[PDB]
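Input for the complex:
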Amino acid sequence: GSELSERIESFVETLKRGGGPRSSEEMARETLGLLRQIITDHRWSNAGELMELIRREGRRMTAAQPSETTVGNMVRRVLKIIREEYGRLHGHYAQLQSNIIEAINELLVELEGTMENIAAQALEHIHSNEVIMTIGFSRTVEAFLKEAARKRKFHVIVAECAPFCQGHEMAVNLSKAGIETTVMTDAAIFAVMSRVNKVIIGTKTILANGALRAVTGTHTLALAAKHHSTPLIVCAPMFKLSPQFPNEEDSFHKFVAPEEVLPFTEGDILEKVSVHCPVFDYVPPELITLFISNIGGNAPSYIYRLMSELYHPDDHVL
Amino acid sequence: GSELSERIESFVETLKRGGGPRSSEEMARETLGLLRQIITDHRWSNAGELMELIRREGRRMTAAQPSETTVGNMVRRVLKIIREEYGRLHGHYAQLQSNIIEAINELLVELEGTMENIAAQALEHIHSNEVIMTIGFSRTVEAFLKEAARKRKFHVIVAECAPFCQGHEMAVNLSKAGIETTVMTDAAIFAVMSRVNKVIIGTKTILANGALRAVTGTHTLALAAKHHSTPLIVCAPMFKLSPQFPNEEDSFHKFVAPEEVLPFTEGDILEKVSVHCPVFDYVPPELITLFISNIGGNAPSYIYRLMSELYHPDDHVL
Ligand SMILES: O=C(COc1ccc(Cl)cc1)N[C@H]1CC[C@H](NC(=O)COc2ccc(Cl)cc2)CC1
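Predicted:
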């Protein structure tokens, strides 16, 4: 009641203001915690009433941060789980609730071992004396690299995503493990791409076409990799996979303050300039070769089957 | 007279039977020796009579081995040299002959230092820790590599041209110099092409389009390099440049016995099979990035200017 609405309002304002928490897996765990806390302390007669309640509570989290699709498609996965439980019990008050409890607990068991399974199958994609190029900062790709370097000796080009230099942290965290890393800017991507053998990047949101949004400037890396014919490896979990079509809804990119691009101390020329800072970008699925999830490697021509197995077509509007 | 026609007949039968001599530079030096010997021991009143005599003597060498264009376009270069001498003396018996003597001597002075100038400018195209892939056997490319390895440390993939494995000699002659070479077949070209940074090949004949014939299977290497966007380096002298257009005349490829592909001890299935062995292939000029001659690096969109500076348009039929 009071604590429920208090924590819901706190989560909504946390998604409205900034990125809280920092890890997307931690935000997914807090999303499952919010959904189990909202189903354990409420009352319903029909399962469709709970479906409408979860939809009404998810619309606010979607309108809080539209660029954060993880809470929205996790709400949609929990909606499909509750729909499948109502379907298997339809062909109902405490038994359905206990089934929802054990299913969301099984979802946390599956979600805690996602990066572990990605690091487990990391060995079948990296050979010795290999030139790797990445962009931005992501825990999945650096875990991939620090597991692949346990038995193999290779090189990683840590290209920074530079609206704000977050890839320096990835370069330092790899060089502490000894991956023989090299730091450059966004302007040397195609200049170094003639020596890059594979492209291993992360993403923020996998779309329904197999398209993906990620840290900005990676569409340029995908174009240079398609020019030089190198395969792209997308190490991405199964909760960044969303049924939002690219040109269907607006607010695709996330815009931040232009201070990180052009500072406030520039002068009188700030009045007559328009400085936009997209921290994301669009990558079409034909520029992608392989997706790496915790269940195995999948093609961009196979994301629709995971969409059918994880999502329901009457929930794509939410 | 007798010794002249004897040596002409010997050179004609040597070009009819096989490849004699083995080096193309040695054959060019013997071509200039044959042309100076045929002009020093004969009589003419007009320069056009000598032009028709050199044309009549060059038609036999062209019909001897049509795949050996070096003697034909060297005869054509000497024809343009004698035409320019007649032009500068037109705006004449011993002075024109002495001018032809000093011009062909200057042509030998320019021809002896071709591979030396290619090895001199070899340094501005090779960097350290580089993956090079070659095909066949050629003295220019191996001289390029053994000069480039005097100050740089890199790797060469010596892919064999395999109607008959001649690239093994190139691999041994490089591994005696320590280039850290690797030997494979023609079937692993696109399999290894995802780690190849540059393609450095030789050629047999540069055509008028900028197209080239070389040791066979290099069109496949050019297609794989165009797929993986690596630049092609053609280390080729300025006497393999000929005005013969690709689709203009017949007998482009040189066919040899099918014994090197399928042996005589195969059995009864040799009666009902057609085994063809082209030891050359066609490479279009859009699959080529850069030509390396002794005067400097030139584009495939610049071969026509060397054609205008070295050849005359009334001599392309010969
Ligand atoms: O050391 C590096 C550093 O790479 C970079 C560092 C920085 C930048 Cl900006 C770009 C690239 N790269 C090595 C990676 C192995 C390669 N190849 C080999 O060592 C051997 O190559 C072979 C050998 C055999 C075959 Cl069949 C194919 C390739 C040499 C260059």
